[PDB]
Fold:
Amino acid sequence: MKTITLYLDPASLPALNQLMDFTQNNEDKTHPRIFGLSRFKIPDNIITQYQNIHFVELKDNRPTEALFTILDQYPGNIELNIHLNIAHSVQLIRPILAYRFKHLDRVSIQQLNLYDNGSMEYVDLEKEENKDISAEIKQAEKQLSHYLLTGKIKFDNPTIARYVWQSAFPVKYHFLSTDYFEKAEFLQPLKEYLAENYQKMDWTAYQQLTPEQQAFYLTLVGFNDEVKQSLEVQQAKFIFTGTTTWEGNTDVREYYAQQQLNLLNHFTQAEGDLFIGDHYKIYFKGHPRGGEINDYILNNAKNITNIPANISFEVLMMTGLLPDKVGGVASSLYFSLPKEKISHIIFTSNKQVKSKEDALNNPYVKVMRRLGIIDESQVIFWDSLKQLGGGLE
Structure:
């Protein structure tokens, strides 16, 4: 038999873990590998070090049928070692299970490794409170058995279905928040069911790699030496999280840049309501779609160091380079952060959030509040902050 390893993820955090897995096994130059990581282009000069390495696109959270052509190149008995995004696991595995169904004499599933997308999974699990979780699990197990057999996907509970793979295959889950599973009383039947099949995401894997593997990993994830050096200064560090625009009663994008500068001043200036201290070196993490707003902010906040948007907070955590403090405009990204690193999260106006009270009801904010990761006082509504000038700095 031949093992083929498939790395599938439309998002970021599962791919970062899967690229770490690849790096840990990167002395094996010929192990068949299929990469379907929509957000990560593996550089040519890595690809050409490997044989039997293949690439598939994802569409609508499934590998395209081009996957079948690759698997057809392995005519013997093949075992699939599959890495997946938990939230998207059902769609991602569908063409794999379709291929298995068609080649049942030679294709088997060796094991699954599944990784959180992010706050998604937790926001979705919260919607299942008050259900009979034991009964939801058992029904999903039966519907998965039908899926693996007849090929008909229908889950009464798509959220719980993400967690019943052990009923069919060997599986390991890698969770952003094991505390959630262990402290959400309503999920105790699921926590017990998952048994030894889950662990916390391994944020220190990078530190155990050889120096050459560390460099390899940084190349895989697009974390170049310029940005890395900028984050190794022996000083306290604060990252401001930028946004795009919000409901400010104007379409003028410059207004939203100026207002984000005002929010930044409340962290950087002693006069600010959110003052972090004069001893922090300031960084800016623009929203990936901020575009020219990010240029406006960088230009008018002179002493700030830009962190490009492709460098996620998780890859900073994966490499041990998270700053000491993070604050600014809110996003579900904050769910991934250690509690000690979160300063203040500022909510802007939209359809669902028009006040601090609304912000406290935000779905990921609610999970974080239950887990004790933030206090309500760390949640700020944007227009509660007065206009504040910058400094000569």
